[PDB]
Design a protein around this ligand. Structure first.
Ligand SMILES: [Cl-]
Ligand SMILES: [Cl-]
Ligand SMILES: [Cl-]
Ligand SMILES: [Cl-]
Ligand SMILES: [Cl-]
Ligand SMILES: [Cl-]
Ligand SMILES: [Cl-]
Ligand SMILES: [Cl-]
Ligand SMILES: [Cl-]
Ligand SMILES: [Cl-]
Ligand SMILES: [Cl-]
Ligand SMILES: [Cl-]
Ligand SMILES: [Cl-]
Ligand SMILES: [Cl-]
Ligand SMILES: [Cl-]
Ligand SMILES: [Cl-]
Ligand SMILES: [Cl-]
Ligand SMILES: [Cl-]
Ligand SMILES: [Cl-]
Ligand SMILES: [Cl-]
Ligand SMILES: [Cl-]
Ligand SMILES: [Cl-]
Ligand SMILES: [Cl-]
Ligand SMILES: [Cl-]
Ligand SMILES: [Cl-]
Ligand SMILES: [Cl-]
Ligand SMILES: [Cl-]
Ligand SMILES: [Cl-]
Ligand SMILES: [Cl-]
Ligand SMILES: [Cl-]
Ligand SMILES: [Cl-]
Ligand SMILES: [Cl-]
Ligand SMILES: [Cl-]
Ligand SMILES: [Cl-]
Ligand SMILES: [Cl-]
Ligand SMILES: [Cl-]
Ligand SMILES: [Cl-]
Ligand SMILES: [Cl-]
Ligand SMILES: [Cl-]
Ligand SMILES: [Cl-]
Ligand SMILES: [Cl-]
Ligand SMILES: [Cl-]
Ligand SMILES: [Cl-]
Ligand SMILES: [Cl-]
Ligand SMILES: [Cl-]
Ligand SMILES: [Cl-]
Ligand SMILES: [Cl-]
Ligand SMILES: [Cl-]
Ligand SMILES: [Fe+2]
Ligand SMILES: [Fe+2]
Ligand SMILES: [Fe+2]
Ligand SMILES: [Fe+2]
Ligand SMILES: [Fe+2]
Ligand SMILES: [Fe+2]
Ligand SMILES: [Fe+2]
Ligand SMILES: [Fe+2]
Ligand SMILES: [Mg+2]
Ligand SMILES: [Mg+2]
Ligand SMILES: [Mg+2]
Ligand SMILES: [Mg+2]
Ligand SMILES: [Mg+2]
Ligand SMILES: [Mg+2]
Ligand SMILES: [Mg+2]
Ligand SMILES: [Mg+2]
Ligand SMILES: [Mg+2]
Ligand SMILES: [Mg+2]
Ligand SMILES: [Mg+2]
Ligand SMILES: [Mg+2]
Ligand SMILES: [Mg+2]
Ligand SMILES: [Mg+2]
Ligand SMILES: [Mg+2]
Ligand SMILES: [Mg+2]
Ligand SMILES: [Mg+2]
Ligand SMILES: [Mg+2]
Ligand SMILES: [Mg+2]
Ligand SMILES: [Mg+2]
Ligand SMILES: [Mg+2]
Ligand SMILES: [Mg+2]
Ligand SMILES: [Mg+2]
Ligand SMILES: [Mg+2]
Ligand SMILES: [Mg+2]
Ligand SMILES: [Mg+2]
Ligand SMILES: [Mg+2]
Lengths: 171, 171, 171, 171
C-alpha cells in the first residue's frame, strides 16, 4: 500500500486509469480530424485548427488524471490508444456530429466515475471531477451543438458556400 | 403632501408608475429574446447579445422613472411584471418584428404621457421625456427597422445562410 | 430532445425555471426598497444604494440560471414577476428584517434544488449551486444579520439618530 | 427695436428682468445664511459653506438671465435687491426650511415665466428655462427636502448633538 493512500478504493483507481485512456482516445480522434481538414482536397484550415486545439486539450485532460492518480497513491496503468473510428470525416457537419457524440461519450464516462466515487464515499474524487471536468464537458458540448445548428442553417452537407462561410466566420 | 411636491398632478404621478411598469415589461421581453437566441438549436449569439443589452437598457429606463418619481415627490407604486407574449421567438426576423412593435408601443405610451404632461402644464415632465426618452425611442425604432429591411433582403425566414450572415455582419 | 441534453431531468429543468423566477422576484423587492429609501421623506441614500446594488446582483443571479438552462439543453420558461409584498418598508430595521427573510427564502429554494439534483444524480447541477449560489447566500445572510444586530444596538426603530448614524458609517 | 429682436414679447422681456431680480434676492438670502452659520455662537462651518456655495450659484443664475436678455435684444433693467426676510436664521432646520420655501418660490416664478413664454409662443425661452433652470430647481428642492427629513430624524431643533452630527456627515 502506498504511504499516501487514504480513502481511495481500488475500483476508483482502476476507473481513473480507464478514464485516462478515454481522454487519450479523444485526443487522437481530434488529431485525425485536424489532419483531415488540413488535406489539400478539404482545406478548411480554421476548422482544422479547432480540432488540433481540441486534441491538445484532451491530452491535458489525460495528464491531469495521471497526476491525480499519483497524488492519491494509485498507480498509472496504460493501455493501447485505439485509432479513431474513421480514417476520413466527410465534411464539417459530419465531423462536428462525431465530436458531439465523442464529447457525450467522455461526459458519460465522467458521470459514471462520479457515481462510483459517490458509492465509495470519495469526496476528493467527486470534487476533482466537478471542479476540473464536468463543467468543461458541458461547455464543450454546448459549443459543438451550437456549431451543428449553424452548419445545418448554412445548408450542410450540400451547400459548399455555407461550409466556406462557417470556416471563415465561426471558428 | 410631500414637502418637495410642486406642480405635479396626481394623474401624471400615476402615469409615471404605469410607464415604469411598461419599461420593465419591455426589459423582460428582451430577456426572453436573449434566452431564445442562446438556445443550442437557435445559436445566434450576436443576436442574443443585442437583445441582452436591450434588456439592460430598458431596466435603466425604468430606474430613471423611479428616480424621477421621487424627485417630484410622487410615490413609486409597483405592479407585477407580466411575462412576455411568446415563449419562443421563431427566428431573427420574427423577433425583430416583435421588437419593432414593442418599441412603438413604448413610444406611444411616452407620447401619451407627454400629452398628459402638456395638458397638466408640467414643463419639467415634458422636458424629461423629450431629453431622456423620445429621441432614444426614435433611434431604436430606426435601428430595428433598418435591421428588418436587411433581414428581408437576406431572404428571411427561409434563407438560413442569410440569417447566419446577418448575425456575423450586422450585430 | 435537445442534442446537448445529457443527464438532465425534466424536474430539474422545471425547478431551475422556478428558481429563475424567484431570483427576479428578489431583484424586484430590492428595487422597491431602493425606491423607498430614496423618498424625500425617508432620505437614507447609502441604504438606498445598498438595496439598488442588491437588486442588480439578483438580476445577475437570474441571468446565470437562464444561461445554465440553455447549456444543459433545457428551455427557459418565464412567468410573471410578482410585485413585492409591501409598497413601503417602514425604516432601515424593518427593511433589513424583510431582506433577511427574503435571502433565507431564496436560500431554502436553492437548498431544495440541490436536494432534487442529488435525488436525480446530477452532479453538474449540484456543483453549479455549490460554486455559484450557496456560499454567496450564506455571506449575504451573515451581512444582513450583522446589520440587524447593529440597528437594534442603535435603538431602531425609535432612535432616529441611530438610524442616521448607521447610514453614514455602516453602508 | 433692437436689430436682433425676433419673436420676443415685451411681457417676456419684463418678466425676465423680474426673474433676474428674484435670483439676486435668493443669492442675498443665502449669503445671509452663510454669515449666520459662520458666527462664533453658531459655528456650523460645513452648513455655512453649503449656503455660501448656494449664494454663488444663484448669482450665476442671475447672470445667465442678463446674458439671455441681451441675446434676444431685450434690455436689462435692474431694481433694488431687497434684504433677506430675517437677520438671524435660528438653526440648521429653520434655515433649511426657509431655503426650501425660497427654492419653491423661485421655481414657481420660473414655471410662471414658462407659462408666459408658452402663451406668447416663444419656444426659445421655453427651451432656455427647461434646459437651464427647471431641472436644477427640482434637484435643489429634493436635496433640501432630504436634508430636512434628516434634521428632523436627528431631533432638531432640540437635539444639539444631532445638529452637530448633520454638519459633520451630511454636508
Ligand atoms: Cl485507501
Ligand atoms: Cl473515510
Ligand atoms: Cl480498495
Ligand atoms: Cl487499471
Ligand atoms: Cl483502458
Ligand atoms: Cl487495448
Ligand atoms: Cl473512414
Ligand atoms: Cl463516441
Ligand atoms: Cl466508472
Ligand atoms: Cl470543469
Ligand atoms: Cl459558458
Ligand atoms: Cl442551403
Ligand atoms: Cl403639486
Ligand atoms: Cl404652476
Ligand atoms: Cl393633483
Ligand atoms: Cl399608481
Ligand atoms: Cl402598471
Ligand atoms: Cl398586474
Ligand atoms: Cl410562444
Ligand atoms: Cl407590443
Ligand atoms: Cl398617459
Ligand atoms: Cl432621448
Ligand atoms: Cl442617430
Ligand atoms: Cl433568398
Ligand atoms: Cl437527459
Ligand atoms: Cl448519468
Ligand atoms: Cl426527464
Ligand atoms: Cl417550467
Ligand atoms: Cl415560476
Ligand atoms: Cl404567475
Ligand atoms: Cl405596504
Ligand atoms: Cl420572504
Ligand atoms: Cl426544487
Ligand atoms: Cl457561491
Ligand atoms: Cl466571508
Ligand atoms: Cl436607544
Ligand atoms: Cl419681437
Ligand atoms: Cl414667430
Ligand atoms: Cl411686444
Ligand atoms: Cl422691466
Ligand atoms: Cl424686479
Ligand atoms: Cl424695489
Ligand atoms: Cl430676524
Ligand atoms: Cl420664500
Ligand atoms: Cl411671468
Ligand atoms: Cl436645468
Ligand atoms: Cl438627480
Ligand atoms: Cl432626539
Ligand atoms: Fe476530455
Ligand atoms: Fe473533450
Ligand atoms: Fe424603454
Ligand atoms: Fe426600448
Ligand atoms: Fe439571488
Ligand atoms: Fe440575494
Ligand atoms: Fe436660482
Ligand atoms: Fe436656488
Ligand atoms: Mg512503502
Ligand atoms: Mg486495485
Ligand atoms: Mg475505454
Ligand atoms: Mg483495431
Ligand atoms: Mg465543488
Ligand atoms: Mg467549476
Ligand atoms: Mg458560444
Ligand atoms: Mg411631511
Ligand atoms: Mg394620486
Ligand atoms: Mg401597462
Ligand atoms: Mg398572464
Ligand atoms: Mg436630446
Ligand atoms: Mg444605423
Ligand atoms: Mg434537434
Ligand atoms: Mg419537462
Ligand atoms: Mg416561485
Ligand atoms: Mg398580486
Ligand atoms: Mg457533492
Ligand atoms: Mg466557492
Ligand atoms: Mg462583515
Ligand atoms: Mg438700431
Ligand atoms: Mg417692453
Ligand atoms: Mg420680484
Ligand atoms: Mg425693506
Ligand atoms: Mg415644449
Ligand atoms: Mg436638462
Ligand atoms: Mg441626494
Amino acid at each position: 500500500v502506498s504511504q499516501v493512500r487514504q480513502n481511495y478504493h481500488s475500483d476508483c483507481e482502476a476507473a481513473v486509469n480507464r478514464m485516462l485512456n478515454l481522454e487519450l482516445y479523444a485526443s487522437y480522434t481530434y488529431s485525425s480530424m485536424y489532419a483531415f481538414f488540413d488535406r489539400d482536397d478539404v482545406a478548411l484550415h480554421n476548422v482544422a485548427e479547432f480540432f488540433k486545439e481540441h486534441s491538445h486539450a484532451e491530452r491535458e485532460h489525460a495528464e491531469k488524471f495521471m497526476k491525480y492518480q499519483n497524488k492519491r497513491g494509485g498507480r498509472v496503468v496504460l493501455q493501447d490508444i485505439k485509432k479513431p473510428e474513421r480514417d476520413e470525416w466527410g465534411n464539417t457537419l459530419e465531423a462536428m456530429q462525431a465530436a458531439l457524440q465523442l464529447e457525450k461519450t467522455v461526459n458519460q464516462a465522467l458521470l459514471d466515475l462520479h457515481k462510483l466515487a459517490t458509492d465509495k464515499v470519495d469526496p476528493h474524487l467527486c470534487d476533482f471531477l466537478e471542479s476540473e471536468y464536468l463543467e468543461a464537458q458541458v461547455k464543450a458540448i454546448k459549443r459543438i451543438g451550437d456549431f451543428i445548428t449553424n452548419l445545418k442553417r448554412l445548408g450542410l452537407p450540400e451547400n459548399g458556400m455555407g461550409e466556406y462561410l462557417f470556416d471563415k466566420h465561426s471558428v
